[PDB]
Amino acid sequence: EFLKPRLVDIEQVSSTHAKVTLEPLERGFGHTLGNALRRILLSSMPGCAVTEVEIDGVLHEYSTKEGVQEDILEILLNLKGLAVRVQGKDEVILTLNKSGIGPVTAADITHDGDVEIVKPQHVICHLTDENASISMRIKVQRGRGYVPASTRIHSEEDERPIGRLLVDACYSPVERIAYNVEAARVEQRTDLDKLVIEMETNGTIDPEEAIRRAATILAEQLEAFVDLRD
């Protein structure tokens, strides 16, 4: 009646780019699976993102320190795009500590055993003074979807410390999803197509785990359909 799609070669043309293939897919199912996986990947992917940042020198987002050529708002904006993976802990607090002239990048963050920076060249700021020193506490936590700092700030009621700065956390690891259904020719069964999913991700989530999580979410959703409450 049906043949079963199986995870076949998952190539990495780039660190952030992954092409995952599903060969044994029935014709008429390629578009269904492709669209479903695209939706799930863009919507419900768990990921690690920065939520709150504590900078020693400043009291709010709209100030600046000495020896930095980027506004504190610009540092927060750059940190928004920071790509990081945490394994054991759901919430971690990284410490960034650097003085001296130079481009303060992501690799300068004090790395723990459970925290991996997959984009070490991601510039955070620039120090243009010899004695200028940056010390920051960057809180990175797990989440899915898009949770801006205007919804949990109503669930925190004006967070008590004034030295901490909340940033909108885009937990989505994947930035681009495409799927192509093409005629997969194989000896058994004349009518089969394969689904080639081309994915651009910030490197935080592996494509294999990505597809597995999307399938898990879809199956959990379909569980309600399987057994109907009457």
């Binding site: 863009l42 919507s43 205007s150 495409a178 081309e198 651009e200």
Partner: protein, 49 residues
């Protein structure tokens, strides 16, 4: 007036439905709904509009 206290409030006001947005040529309008990124029509490469 004995004293004056001036306070500056900085609102990081984000784009949302209802805000008036336009083009340079005169095309106007109001943002109706901010759909999730997936709902956007996307090209062959996969970039959603």
């Amino acid at each position: 007036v004995l004293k004056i206290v001036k306070v500056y409030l900085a609102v990081k006001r984000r784009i949302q439905p209802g805000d008036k947005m336009a083009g340079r040529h005169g095309n106007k309008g109001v943002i109706s709904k901010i759909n999730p990124i997936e709902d956007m029509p996307y090209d062959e490469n996969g970039t959603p509009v």
